[PDB]
Design a protein around this ligand. Structure first.
Ligand SMILES: O=C(O)C1=C[C@H](O)[C@H](O)[C@H](O[C@H]2[C@H](O)[C@H](O)[C@H](O[C@H]3[C@H](O)[C@H](O)[C@H](O)O[C@@H]3C(=O)O)O[C@@H]2C(=O)O)O1
Ligand SMILES: [Ca+2]
Length: 489
């Protein structure tokens, strides 16, 4: 083909483990199409049965028989760290000489290129570049509001009242107290509930991210506002307003809790969450989620903390052991070209989409399925966190008119907080970040889970928490980031 990057079929070994559940699959329809178009085939050497993607990365890197390519989600920091240590090769020259689509992309998106570079100036991975503006929003069961003769909640006091009514007043009508007012497929969203009491939970679409407040680098989970917000979240969990299994239900929470007519309220992405309106029309009579503006928080503001990232901390890299770096960067380049963006965004021609008027258009069966289109695509190897350039037109096609009115409402309302994009640390500053931040984050999450589940009291353990943050190096990390901030700005 005209899109081939090599004349002889080339097989590369990839270690890709993502979202704690999935691996590259050469027998994916999209992987087969990838091979057809590029003449490069990726063979997985990852453990399909393993259940923690970050631990699989760590194991593989420690094991001495490195693959040719490493890919996955939440690997930016490790791509940079181990790139500098020489396990991943710098891509700057390879891109300049052999990857015209990536080169053009970075030229038009210099902020993205700057955001993925290591302190030594090297590019150690090609990223997942999202396309879009908003990410999550709030959704509530309008049919339950109607049955209970309640209005959509305008503020946090009204939200509490409405969730309490969902809990206590049997809106699914079975005479059982089985309603679970707040559910979420991302456990981390339980902490984002602190927004309703004027506390940040994150500076970005990455959970538990740093943020900038009045020229100061802060971590949201270290602030007293977070302490006070978490007291409210713990009380909601105690009262059963939050899914008891919020920390373990995970990916199919909507299918289980909306499909089972148990859930009343969530914070999740506009396109896929609103698909459940048509998806459940048959099996759950009357089901209707509506987007609502964030209920006014305790400080008088409507917050949407989440936003679409300019670039995600995901993608793939070329290892030092890869004997075909030129073919590999050309293969990478395919996913920033139109033919490669088609399959990585839309799937396989004649299976999920067709070219019509020169553009990829999803088939009717795809657009009508109760399964959200991005889930359909995951199952065949598209919309996966390789290095690729996402195309928002894929998403437009299954964004319902009602979902779009929600998006436009959030844009017009200016609810969406601008995200933290990072600071430009030196090698020595980032080394402190590398030393401490993962340990701190793990400690934070464990404490937060205990607070939510009520096994630790927030007020009674806050001093210990702060002592721990200090001896685990959080404030050293903040110091380093503040230094980088002060130079930058
Ligand atoms: O659901 C949508 O409407 C939607 C539209 C966009 O086109 C993307 O497909 C978007 O994908 C999201 C997805 O909804 C999840 O939020 C996912 O979260 C994963 C995180 O990216 C990290 O990988 C985390 O460690 O795991 C999360 C997970 O496993 O769910 O992120 C994708 C994405 O950003 O592409 O959804
Ligand atoms: Ca009930």
């Amino acid at each position: 083909e005209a899109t081939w990057v090599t004349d002889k079929p080339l097989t590369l070994k990839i270690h890709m483990h993502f979202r704690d559940k999935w691996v590259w699959d050469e027998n994916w329809p999209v992987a087969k199409e990838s091979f057809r178009l590029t003449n490069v085939k990726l063979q997985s050497v990852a453990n399909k049965a393993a259940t923690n993607s970050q631990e699989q990365f760590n194991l593989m890197m420690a094991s001495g028989d490195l693959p040719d390519v490493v890919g996955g989600d939440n690997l930016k920091d490790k791509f940079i760290q181990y790139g500098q240590e020489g396990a991943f090769v710098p891509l700057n020259k390879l891109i300049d000489q052999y990857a015209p689509h990536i080169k053009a992309f970075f030229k038009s998106h210099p902020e993205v290129e700057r955001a993925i570079k290591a302190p030594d100036g090297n590019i150690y991975f090609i990223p997942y570049v999202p396309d879009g503006v908003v990410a999550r929003g709030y959704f509530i069961r309008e049919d339950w509001l109607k049955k209970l003769n309640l209005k959509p909640p305008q503020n946090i006091d009204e939200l509490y009242t409405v969730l309490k009514a969902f809990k206590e007043k049997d809106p699914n009508g079975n005479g059982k107290a089985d309603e679970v007012p707040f559910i979420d497929r991302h456990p981390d969203e339980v902490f984002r509930l602190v927004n309703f009491w004027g506390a940040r939970s994150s500076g970005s679409d990455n959970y538990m991210d740093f943020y900038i407040d009045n020229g100061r680098v802060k971590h949201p989970w270290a602030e007293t506002a977070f302490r006070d917000g978490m007291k409210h979240v713990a009380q909601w969990y105690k009262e059963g307003l939050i899914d008891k299994e919020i920390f373990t239900r995970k990916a199919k929470a909507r299918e289980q809790m909306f499909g089972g007519n148990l859930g009343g309220f969530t914070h999740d992405w506009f396109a896929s969450t609103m698909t459940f309106n048509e998806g459940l029309a048959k099996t759950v009579p009357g089901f209707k989620l509506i987007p609502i503006a964030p209920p006014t928080n305790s400080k008088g503001q409507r917050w949407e903390e989440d936003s679409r990232q300019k670039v995600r901390p995901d993608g793939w890299a070329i290892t030092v052991k890869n004997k075909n770096p030129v073919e590999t960067i050309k293969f990478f380049d395919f996913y920033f070209s139109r033919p490669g963006r088609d399959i990585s965004n839309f799937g396989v021609p004649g299976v999920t989409y067709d070219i019509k008027n020169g553009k990829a258009v999803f088939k009717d069966s795809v657009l009508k399925s109760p399964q959200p289109v991005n889930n359909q695509l995951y199952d065949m190897g598209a919309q996966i966190p390789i290095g690729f350039w996402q195309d928002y037109d894929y998403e437009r096609q299954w964004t319902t008119p009602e979902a779009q009115a929600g998006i436009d409402m959030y844009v017009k309302g200016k609810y969406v907080m601008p995200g933290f994009e990072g600071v430009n640390m030196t090698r020595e500053e980032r080394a402190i970040y590398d030393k401490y931040w993962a340990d701190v984050r793990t400690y934070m999450y464990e404490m937060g889970q205990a607070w939510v589940m009520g096994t630790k009291d927030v007020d009674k353990t806050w001093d210990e928490y702060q002592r721990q943050l200090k001896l685990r190096g959080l404030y050293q990390v903040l110091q380093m980031m503040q230094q980088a901030y002060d130079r930058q700005y």
